[PDB]
Design an enzyme around this catalytic site. Sequence first.
Site, short mmCIF file in Angstrom:
data_model
loop_
_atom_site.label_atom_id
_atom_site.label_comp_id
_atom_site.label_asym_id
_atom_site.label_seq_id
_atom_site.Cartn_x
_atom_site.Cartn_y
_atom_site.Cartn_z
N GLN A 11 0.82 -1.21 0.00
CA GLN A 11 0.00 0.00 0.00
C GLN A 11 0.85 1.26 0.00
O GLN A 11 0.63 2.17 -0.80
CB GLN A 11 -0.94 0.01 1.21
CG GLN A 11 -1.79 1.26 1.32
CD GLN A 11 -2.78 1.21 2.45
OE1 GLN A 11 -3.63 0.32 2.51
NE2 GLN A 11 -2.69 2.16 3.37
N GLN A 15 1.03 3.85 -3.20
CA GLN A 15 0.44 5.17 -3.04
C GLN A 15 1.51 6.26 -3.10
O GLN A 15 1.25 7.36 -3.60
CB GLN A 15 -0.33 5.26 -1.73
CG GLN A 15 -1.58 4.38 -1.71
CD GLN A 15 -2.48 4.64 -0.52
OE1 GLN A 15 -3.70 4.48 -0.61
NE2 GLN A 15 -1.90 5.03 0.61
N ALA A 99 -1.10 -9.86 3.18
CA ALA A 99 -0.23 -10.53 4.13
C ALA A 99 -0.62 -10.26 5.58
O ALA A 99 0.12 -10.62 6.50
CB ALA A 99 1.21 -10.12 3.89
N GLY A 143 4.18 -3.05 6.81
CA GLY A 143 3.26 -3.94 6.13
C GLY A 143 3.81 -5.35 5.96
O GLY A 143 5.02 -5.56 6.00
N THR A 145 3.23 -7.18 3.17
CA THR A 145 3.70 -7.20 1.80
C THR A 145 4.96 -6.34 1.67
O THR A 145 5.99 -6.81 1.19
CB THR A 145 2.63 -6.70 0.82
OG1 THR A 145 1.44 -7.49 0.97
CG2 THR A 145 3.12 -6.79 -0.61
N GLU A 183 4.64 -4.10 13.77
CA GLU A 183 5.46 -3.45 12.76
C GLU A 183 6.95 -3.44 13.12
O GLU A 183 7.79 -3.47 12.23
CB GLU A 183 4.96 -2.02 12.52
CG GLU A 183 3.59 -2.00 11.86
CD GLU A 183 3.20 -0.63 11.34
OE1 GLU A 183 2.11 -0.53 10.73
OE2 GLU A 183 3.96 0.33 11.54
N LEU A 252 22.87 5.21 -10.73
CA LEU A 252 22.65 4.61 -9.42
C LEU A 252 23.96 4.23 -8.74
O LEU A 252 24.05 4.19 -7.51
CB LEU A 252 21.75 3.38 -9.54
CG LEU A 252 20.37 3.60 -10.15
CD1 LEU A 252 19.63 2.29 -10.24
CD2 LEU A 252 19.57 4.62 -9.35
N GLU A 254 26.63 5.94 -8.68
CA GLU A 254 27.25 7.11 -8.10
C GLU A 254 26.68 7.42 -6.71
O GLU A 254 27.34 8.05 -5.89
CB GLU A 254 27.08 8.31 -9.02
CG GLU A 254 28.20 9.33 -8.91
CD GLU A 254 28.07 10.45 -9.92
OE1 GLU A 254 27.86 10.16 -11.12
OE2 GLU A 254 28.18 11.63 -9.52
N1 LIG Z 1 3.93 7.59 4.34
C1 LIG Z 1 3.03 6.65 4.08
N2 LIG Z 1 2.97 5.52 4.87
C2 LIG Z 1 2.05 4.57 4.61
C3 LIG Z 1 1.16 4.71 3.55
N3 LIG Z 1 0.36 3.62 3.52
C4 LIG Z 1 0.72 2.80 4.52
N4 LIG Z 1 1.76 3.37 5.21
C5 LIG Z 1 2.46 2.80 6.37
O1 LIG Z 1 2.78 1.46 6.08
C6 LIG Z 1 2.65 0.65 7.23
C7 LIG Z 1 1.82 -0.60 6.91
O2 LIG Z 1 2.25 -1.17 5.70
P1 LIG Z 1 1.31 -1.21 4.39
O3 LIG Z 1 2.02 -0.70 3.17
O4 LIG Z 1 0.07 -0.39 4.66
O5 LIG Z 1 0.89 -2.76 4.25
P2 LIG Z 1 1.23 -3.71 2.99
O6 LIG Z 1 2.60 -3.46 2.40
O7 LIG Z 1 0.16 -3.56 1.94
O8 LIG Z 1 1.21 -5.17 3.65
P3 LIG Z 1 -0.16 -5.98 3.95
O9 LIG Z 1 -1.35 -5.07 4.07
O10 LIG Z 1 0.04 -6.75 5.22
O11 LIG Z 1 -0.36 -6.94 2.81
C8 LIG Z 1 1.99 1.49 8.30
O12 LIG Z 1 2.92 1.76 9.33
C9 LIG Z 1 1.58 2.77 7.61
O13 LIG Z 1 1.77 3.90 8.43
C10 LIG Z 1 1.22 5.84 2.76
O14 LIG Z 1 0.44 5.98 1.82
N5 LIG Z 1 2.16 6.81 3.03
MG LIG Z 2 -1.92 -4.33 2.31
#
Ligand SMILES: Nc1nc2c(ncn2[C@@H]2O[C@H](COP(=O)(O)OP(=O)(O)OP(=O)(O)O)[C@@H](O)[C@H]2O)c(=O)[nH]1
Ligand SMILES: [Mg+2]
Lengths: 437, 430, 331, 54
Positions: A11, A15, A99, A143, A145, A183, A252, A254
């Site tokens: 995610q 994003q 995940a 996360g 993933t 986390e 990259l 450098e």
């Molecule tokens: N800066 C920022 N942090 C994010 C964002 N989205 C999620 N996070 C952070 O990412 C962490 C969680 O990981 P995620 O990327 O949401 O989860 P994932 O990689 O999809 O893994 P799973 O959902 O378990 O499959 C949290 O601590 C969030 O604060 C974002 O859009 N911007």
């Molecule tokens: Mg996710």
Amino acid sequence: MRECISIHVGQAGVQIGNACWELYCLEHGIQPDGQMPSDKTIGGGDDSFNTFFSETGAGKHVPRAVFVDLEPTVIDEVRTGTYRQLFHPEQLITGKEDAANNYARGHYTIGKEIIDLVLDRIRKLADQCTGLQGFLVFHSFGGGTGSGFTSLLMERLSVDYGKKSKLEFSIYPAPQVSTAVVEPYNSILTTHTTLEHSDCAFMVDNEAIYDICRRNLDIERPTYTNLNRLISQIVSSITASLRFDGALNVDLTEFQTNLVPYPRIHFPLATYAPVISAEKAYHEQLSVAEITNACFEPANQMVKCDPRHGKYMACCLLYRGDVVPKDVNAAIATIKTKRSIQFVDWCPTGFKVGINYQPPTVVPGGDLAKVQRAVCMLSNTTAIAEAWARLDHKFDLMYAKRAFVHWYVGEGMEEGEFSEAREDMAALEKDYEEVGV
Amino acid sequence: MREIVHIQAGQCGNQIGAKFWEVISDEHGIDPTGSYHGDSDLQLERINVYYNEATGNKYVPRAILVDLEPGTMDSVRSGPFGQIFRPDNFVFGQSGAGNNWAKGHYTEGAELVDSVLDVVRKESESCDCLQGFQLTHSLGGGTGSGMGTLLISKIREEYPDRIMNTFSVMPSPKVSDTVVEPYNATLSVHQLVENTDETYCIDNEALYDICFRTLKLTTPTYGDLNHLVSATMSGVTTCLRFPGQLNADLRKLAVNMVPFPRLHFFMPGFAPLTSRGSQQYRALTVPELTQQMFDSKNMMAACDPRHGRYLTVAAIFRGRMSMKEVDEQMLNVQNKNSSYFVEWIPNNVKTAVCDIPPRGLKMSATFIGNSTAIQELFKRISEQFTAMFRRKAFLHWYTGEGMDEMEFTEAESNMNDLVSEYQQYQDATA
Amino acid sequence: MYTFVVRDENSSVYAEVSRLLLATGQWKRLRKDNPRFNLMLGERNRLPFGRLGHEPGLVQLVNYYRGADKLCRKASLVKLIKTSPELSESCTWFPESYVIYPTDEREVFLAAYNRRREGGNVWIAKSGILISSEASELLDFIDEVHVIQKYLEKPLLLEPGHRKFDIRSWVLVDHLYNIYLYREGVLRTSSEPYNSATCHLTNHCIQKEYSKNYGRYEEGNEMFFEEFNQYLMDALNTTLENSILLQIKHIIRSCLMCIEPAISTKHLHYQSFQLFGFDFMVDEELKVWLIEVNGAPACAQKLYAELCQGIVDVAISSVFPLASIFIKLHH
Amino acid sequence: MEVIELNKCTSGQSFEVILKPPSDPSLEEIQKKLEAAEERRKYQEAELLKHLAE
Ligand SMILES: Nc1nc2c(ncn2[C@@H]2O[C@H](COP(=O)(O)OP(=O)(O)OP(=O)(O)O)[C@@H](O)[C@H]2O)c(=O)[nH]1
Ligand SMILES: [Mg+2]
Ligand SMILES: Nc1ncnc2c1ncn2[C@@H]1O[C@H](COP(=O)(O)OP(=O)(O)CP(=O)(O)O)[C@@H](O)[C@H]1O
Ligand SMILES: Nc1nc2c(ncn2[C@@H]2O[C@H](COP(=O)(O)OP(=O)(O)O)[C@@H](O)[C@H]2O)c(=O)[nH]1
Ligand SMILES: [Ca+2]
Ligand SMILES: [Mg+2]
Ligand SMILES: [Mg+2]
């Protein structure tokens, strides 16, 4: 010209990737259409921006990027969003179930079932590169993933692309926006497995950019949209040299050469200024001396630490806007007398400087104001080890009671990997202390 | 499109179960005929979690109604939202279980369980990506308690990699139906500790005291008790039913709430506490929600949280409010009472906010806590259990269905083990 | 309600502060490892500064300055004064000093030492201490990290007794880096006549152990400022303020203003304060010298109550308001 | 304060300023680990379905 492939995982990675490529398109004058009027060479190009964009016969400019996530909601928004015409479907890869914030589930269980697909989709981008130089991987530590699948991918990329460099843009976990209690586990686990496979990793603590948004953008409760818009400016500053004509950090390789003397110590601290709210009616534009001086304030760092109580191994100043060398040197000269800046004995006390005359581009309707000059300082300081120490402490607290450990074991992982990863982090903290004290 | 399959067993299970679907159908803008008539896209963005879509854009609850007597299920079918349920998903016998766990688990329920699993299977096959199952039942009876835990054990066999959640009602002598309820509950807890990932402990002792002391209802009915449950169930499923970041699915909720597999018995809370038709006009301030949600008097399990420590907490705020103020007030609770939250699980309080409030309220807050104080609940049932079992009273009802005294001894031991495991982490230090 | 934690049990000063805080009723003490604190009375060594200021909704304060050790360690103080242009090699209130390693400035110390003999050449080696004119002896003592400093051969001697002394000054630096000098200082006196050839070391511990005359002139060989000022008016026709304190207040400022850029917590995510203990010698000419700075100083028995209450009022209550004994050394 | 390697172009310019001088695992090994974890899962599930069978 040597191509760079971006890989956005989970995610956070996806994003953030959205914010970056939206910003890249504005900076290069590329439309959501994918068309780029300024590009007169149709169907192909050897230009600097081609590092990040390939070209079609119809004149569409396509991000050399792959989005991966074990759950389709986030990537589905890219498929239906403003820049849907920009990517082609094979770039956007999605599973069915995520995940569940579990490293083991992302690495071992679900990772095993999609790893060969992703590599094959990456392989198809690589086959369109005349001289692929490496990968930029965006992900989170927290996360399942972002942590679990990324570490598996980084392991396989080193096998399939042993000669190529790999840079990380990692999001470090912060309670104010974190969505999981485990986390700290995922972080130590992915750091341990990824360490030898990453050449240069830029950490971004959500805590830091969260407070920057409250303090300087006057945002009461920042959303991911607010955070990502600011992050993308930092990423853009760091990757600008790969996308524009210059002579500093043009490949990259450098980045490692300039910022990473010791391989394990490859986490440069990023600092950015000025961050000005678009809602401020009256604003006095800051000088070179004022933004440069701001690069030594912890309140402007991507990770909150204290470089005064560590040592530098390298420093890069990346300027964007109305800046000339004479004003930089004059600012550095003043700062060196006023601030505590100590390098390691075996390194020159100096700064590699890069200036791009084009001021920072800001998303229309965004939170950031247009400024005439800005700077991003990349400094490899030992003080960033404070982040590892905070993280390792939280790890030790939970693991002493084996809290939540059963979720990982249940996915096939062995409890030994917890201690193995913690040992590697203990050694890393030890390396930092030796170099910096 | 992560589907949940709902199951409701016994009288209590189907009563609360029916009310649950009435409440959330209203929140999602679904009428008793299955037609949508809402005014927001947020209502349908995750409708597929609990509902199936048919032609004519009808929404049908993914619910399976189970009982060993046709009584309550005939009441549901004749209820307001009776037509909404899939007619073939009504699965019932005729004999009843006579408040006998052994009848529901080993004899009467064994005869009916395969028919239920045939309906469960048909529902699961239609799922794009099944999360798992949620069961509503009481532990004091025979069907919901005996057959319910039988269903759970069978569902786990066919679906071992899916999440098993339960809304389990605990028996209280204040609302007692029979004297054998401590036997049925202890036997059931023995099953839940083994075969469930998440169990919300809804205590009839707590529900009654809330109705009497707080809501000033001198003579509480089951309808008054279920007003509180349906409100709690709506609250704790908010993160599952609407777009959100925190605890958006059953597995992520389990990972955040369950540090140890056996300790998955949650203590739910709700604020503001309201009675049916009270229709209060003043919304609570964010500070008022926060102080009340954590108050002992708002807990749906009769346990004093100050007599233990919180392992994990999940807070859900509903309505239009300042997220800044929610964060400040939630941080304020933890910092003012930091001794009640274990120090060896950092940041063990997660907060979610949903823009859509429950019906009749502008502002509401739901609390889900994994506290070690929940042991008081199992201690209570254990005392009542041992009081009879030391004299082997009323066991003939059970040995007549084939059970042996040893199975009671084992069930008692495992629940006492559960109590001692909570006490272990209540005294643990970092 | 404010909250705090205690991680240094061997602190007499902050044990009193801890007691005083609890006595307000507005401060609650947590377990040592509870991170949700407003105040930390940290440990003396390896204090986790890296884990401070990362708790949402909490203003966190600690009773130590990270990097203040550069002023409080023997060898570090020497290196600080020599290499800092604000203090410089040409510093007139710090004795000539050199850093030596056993088994470095050995070559430089001898270079100046040979100058001394041709044509007073007494020195002192500090880590057990050894005073001697023989350089070859001192170097041997070190081998079996030290600082070699010029021994003050002509100290101011108190009468009756013909005895030496040192002055302890307690300084409080708050979160705004306001320098506060405590009204009351103490003279750790020798109860033995100063012999040009136990009487040389004014250490309270050494005095109690090796001195027959301990406690005859004053309580526990501790003369306070009211008496010492009076003596100075009667014997030398001057005041403590003019002859000595002006120099003291100068030295305290110079040292702390020098190190300020390196340790200031003005724009940090956590705040620091600290109590320092400056030790001074004064010679025949009423010239003040700096010996050392103590990062974790104890206090004189009768001064604990007043000083500790000042720490709460100035350093703690300033950051955490509840529901002067200090002289502000202006910059 | 020595400036070195000054490069210029239409887009901008870069340079360095010095204040003071100085004073692996194979694809095979990956496939095994993932499979070793998969077997540990299959074993744990087998024990469960064995327990339930009893
Ligand atoms: N800066 C920022 N942090 C994010 C964002 N989205 C999620 N996070 C952070 O990412 C962490 C969680 O990981 P995620 O990327 O949401 O989860 P994932 O990689 O999809 O893994 P799973 O959902 O378990 O499959 C949290 O601590 C969030 O604060 C974002 O859009 N911007
Ligand atoms: Mg996710
Ligand atoms: N350069 C010097 N010239 C003259 N006398 C000196 C001196 N250095 C030390 N002394 C004397 O020797 C004593 C040793 O104290 P030092 O402060 O050097 O060690 P310490 O740090 O173990 C004692 P404290 O911490 O209580 O001050 C001093 O109080 C002073 O009386
Ligand atoms: N809250 C609530 N509890 C109930 C209701 N009906 C029964 N109970 C409780 O359930 C227990 C009896 O179980 P019951 O549902 O009648 O057994 P079953 O239908 O044979 O499985 C008693 O402890 C009752 O307090 C109800 O409508 N609401
Ligand atoms: Ca082109
Ligand atoms: Mg009944
Ligand atoms: Mg000392």
